[PDB]
Design a protein around this ligand. Structure first.
Ligand SMILES: CCO[C@@H](Cc1ccc2c(ccn2Cc2nc(-c3ccccc3Cl)oc2C)c1)C(=O)O
Lengths: 10, 258
């Protein structure tokens, strides 16, 4: 969730 | 093939330099005083901690402080994982899972880089907190760091450098056996390639180090036990030490972990 944000950030 | 494995090794090292501002190379320069900049301030007691706190009980403040660095390190490790070839193409839920189970194993790996037998570098290497001071903290906070020091001393005896660590770290993140993975195969395939790259790296970088590769792989399993102990300590704190919470990011990593 916060992990998803970090993972998909560019 | 050999050239590809070396280019993989180098790609991982470059990514590691881009992701982690404070390397083992720099850390050791600081710990051995082979640097031009100021000696780090030593935190060895309560009022020593006071003076350094410039540049709510003691044990809680330290534990709250750890968390801010922990979440910063989670961000760094995530950025590094996104540079491992094949990783961003995995099902996103599997990336989350890989990250969730892998992240603290990596934090403790890299923390060993900032440790010697007497203490640990904090705040980007500007402070040094003695192992003895951390051991002095009241139950259960005084039990947090000691297993990490015990691991770090033995881990550091292997004398891995940043280039070794970049591959080591990638191998751990790409563990096909994390609980609840949807697609194990493409993870094992990537890991198999990274292991080949690690084996070649250790042979070329440490030709005389007996069974280094096998020794390293073992440490990967030892890290899980360290995380296990940390998590059970956190569960005690959750149950019995209630006035101070856990950063939301860390709650998310730890929620339903194992
Ligand atoms: C209790 C939180 O534990 C972390 C893991 C953890 C523990 C310890 C960690 C880090 C990162 C650096 N350290 C070493 C450390 N960093 C600090 C610190 C860092 C900044 C300010 C003040 C302090 Cl006392 O203290 C200590 C012991 C991460 C977690 O579960 O996410």
């Amino acid at each position: 969730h916060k992990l998803v944000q970090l993972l998909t950030t560019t | 093939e050999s050239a590809d494995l070396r280019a993989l090794a180098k790609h991982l090292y470059d990514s590691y330099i881009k992701s982690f501002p404070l390397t083992k190379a720099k850390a050791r320069a600081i710990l051995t005083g082979k640097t031009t900049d100021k000696s780090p301030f030593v935190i060895y007691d309560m009022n020593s901690l006071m003076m350094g706190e410039d540049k709510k009980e003691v044990a809680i403040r330290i534990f709250q402080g750890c968390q801010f660095r922990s979440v910063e390190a989670v961000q760094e490790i995530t950025e590094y994982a996104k540079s491992i070839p094949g990783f961003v193409n995995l099902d996103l839920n599997d990336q989350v899972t890989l990250l969730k189970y892998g992240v603290h194993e990596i934090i403790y790996t890299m923390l060993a880089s900032l440790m010697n037998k007497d203490g640990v570098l904090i705040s980007e290497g500007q402070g040094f907190m003695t192992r003895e001071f951390l051991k002095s903290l009241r139950k259960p906070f005084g039990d947090f760091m000691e297993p990490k020091f015990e691991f770090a001393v033995k881990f550091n005896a292997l004398e891995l450098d940043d280039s070794d660590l970049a591959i080591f770290i990638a191998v751990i993140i790409l563990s096909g056996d994390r609980p609840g993975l949807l697609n194990v195969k493409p993870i094992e395939d990537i890991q198999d390639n990274l292991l080949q790259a690690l084996e070649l790296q250790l042979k070329l970088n440490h030709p005389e180090s007996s069974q280094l590769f096998a020794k390293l792989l073992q440490k990967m399993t030892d890290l899980r036990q360290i995380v296990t102990e940390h998590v059970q300590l956190l569960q005690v704190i959750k149950k019995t030490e209630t006035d101070m919470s856990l950063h939301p990011l860390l709650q998310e990593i730890y929620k339903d972990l194992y």
